[PDB]
């Protein structure tokens, strides 16, 4: 017989299977459509989720109840030191999809990216790319031949970039290497840009700008094995239920004589790859810029780092991207920020945000002071010091 009362199904069938992502770095499965009249530029960037804070800004939204009024918004900080270009990959189109034809690497690779090719770095002989570096012996004839092949072919060009994880407070010490598509046409000059940027850093400000809507691609926080009640949001069974109530009561009708894929079952929760879109960049902050957390209204010479440091992350000493809201993944996790795949003109995008204040109070508790100077001013002289 029928359900006897309609209700929407629990969970989204388009995010199946609810399995662990194959890698801690979520893959970029679609790059922005190439506009071959633009200059050559990266379509994404690699950063590390540092943590969240809150900001205050004047809302510019005509017709809204809060137009020209102050709004408090949550923001996520992604530490984004410049990424080092170490290779270029050429992609030819085939009746069986895109196919990498060849990769040309830089002559010199730092130990940060060399660690990525080693499971046991400390006891290895560090031979990686030692014979490849000899391709640059006198004139780089083999390197130029491979680049000429990429120019003669490979309708799609991607660069190999790696993070400078040594510039982050993370203990990992092993860089993250990823392919970023080069948009801005003339495949010839795509390859030329890649080669000219070999071994050179690319700053996040050359990829992303203030107010730009971007997408965050990251592996979500893992939670291990989870029951149906929290994994899928199913109704808790009554207190009277024998054999447990954090379950799904009927996992299927008699026919089909099988548990169906669409029934909620207990299993892994989290550690899934997610591509969340339309996060507006609130700040493109620079690492060398003291008063990073300052605005034109605050003027307090303070960095973006909360007092006591970002909890479980550390201090932001590099360039950072501050996006509105939250993004998938937890602190210290590598996240790929990519340009939007379409042109958003909904007046939510195209809004020019101007921060009025950035919270730098401690996230290690109910933080009361933005700066140590403010703490001193409020508290006066203590016995230990200050």
């Amino acid at each position: 017989s029928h359900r006897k009362y309609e209700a929407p199904r629990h969970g989204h069938l388009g995010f199946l299977p609810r399995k662990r992502a194959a890698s801690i770095r979520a893959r970029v499965k679609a790059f922005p459509k190439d506009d071959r009249s633009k200059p050559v530029a990266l379509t994404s960037f690699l950063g590390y989720k540092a943590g969240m804070t809150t900001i205050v800004r004047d809302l510019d939204r005509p017709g809204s109840k809060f137009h020209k009024r102050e709004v408090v918004e949550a923001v996520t900080v992604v530490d984004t030191p410049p990424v080092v270009v170490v290779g270029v990959v050429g992609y030819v189109e085939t009746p069986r999809g895109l196919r990498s034809l060849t990769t040309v690497w830089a002559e010199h690779l730092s130990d940060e990216v060399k660690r990525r090719f080693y499971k046991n770095w400390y006891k290895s002989k560090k031979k990686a790319f030692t014979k490849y570096s000899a391709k640059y012996a006198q004139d780089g004839a083999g390197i130029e031949r491979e680049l000429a092949r990429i120019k003669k072919y490979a309708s799609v060009v991607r660069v190999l970039v790696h993070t400078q994880i040594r510039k982050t407070p993370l203990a990992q010490k092993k860089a993250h290497l990823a392919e970023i598509q080069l948009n801005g046409g003339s495949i010839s000059e795509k390859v030329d840009w890649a080669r000219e940027h070999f071994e050179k850093t690319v700053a996040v400000d050359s990829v992303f700008e203030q107010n730009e809507m971007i997408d965050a691609i990251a592996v979500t926080k893992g939670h291990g094995f989870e029951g149906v009640t929290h994994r899928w949001g199913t109704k808790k069974l009554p207190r009277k239920t024998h054999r447990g109530l954090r379950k799904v009561a009927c996992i299927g009708a008699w026919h089909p004589a099988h548990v169906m894929w669409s029934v909620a079952r207990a299993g892994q929760r989290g550690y899934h790859s997610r591509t969340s879109i339309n996060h507006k960049i609130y700040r493109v902050g620079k690492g060398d810029d003291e008063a990073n957390g300052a605005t034109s209204f605050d003027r307090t010479k303070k960095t973006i780092t909360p007092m006591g440091g970002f909890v479980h992350y550390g201090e932001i000493k590099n360039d950072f991207i501050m996006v509105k809201g939250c993004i998938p993944g937890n602190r210290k996790r590598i996240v790929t920020l990519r340009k939007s795949l379409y042109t958003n003109t909904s007046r939510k995008a195209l809004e020019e945000v101007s921060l009025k204040w950035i919270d730098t109070a401690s996230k290690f508790g109910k933080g009361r002071f933005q700066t140590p100077a403010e703490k001193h001013a409020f508290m006066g002289t203590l016995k230990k010091d200050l």
Partner: protein, 129 residues
């Protein structure tokens, strides 16, 4: 016409009657504009029109269904300016389906959202949030 306010008054909630209509409490039986979800109680927030009865109060107001407007919530809600605020109690005022109050005066404060939503409530109100 109003930002979302954290619901604090599901069906069955009894709030104080803050007007001078002669009712002393209002018993939520419905929330206007509320959606439908299996087992989900329709819940009211500050500024919401509800259907209510008068459990205790002047007798000719009792035993009948009337529109009411929630003017105080006491369940913490977040404003867009980041402030989490709540009143001391839950309070509402009797009104007609067009939003005009049955009484002529409000006792106590009135939520800014409710006053912005209902000009009659704002006109009869005293202190606003």
């Amino acid at each position: 016409t109003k930002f979302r306010i954290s619901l604090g008054l599901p069906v069955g909630a009894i709030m104080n009657c803050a007007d001078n209509s002669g009712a002393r409490n209002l018993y939520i039986i419905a929330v206007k504009g509320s959606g439908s979800r299996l087992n989900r109680l329709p819940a009211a927030s500050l500024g919401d029109m509800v259907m209510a009865t008068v459990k205790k109060g002047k007798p000719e107001l009792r035993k009948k269904v009337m529109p009411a407007i929630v003017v105080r919530q006491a369940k913490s809600w977040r404003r867009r300016d980041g402030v989490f605020l709540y009143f001391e109690d839950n309070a509402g005022v009797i009104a007609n389906p067009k939003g005009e109050m049955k009484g002529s005066a409000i006792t106590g404060p009135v939520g800014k959202e409710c006053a912005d939503l209902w000009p009659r409530v704002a006109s009869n109100s005293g202190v606003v949030v």
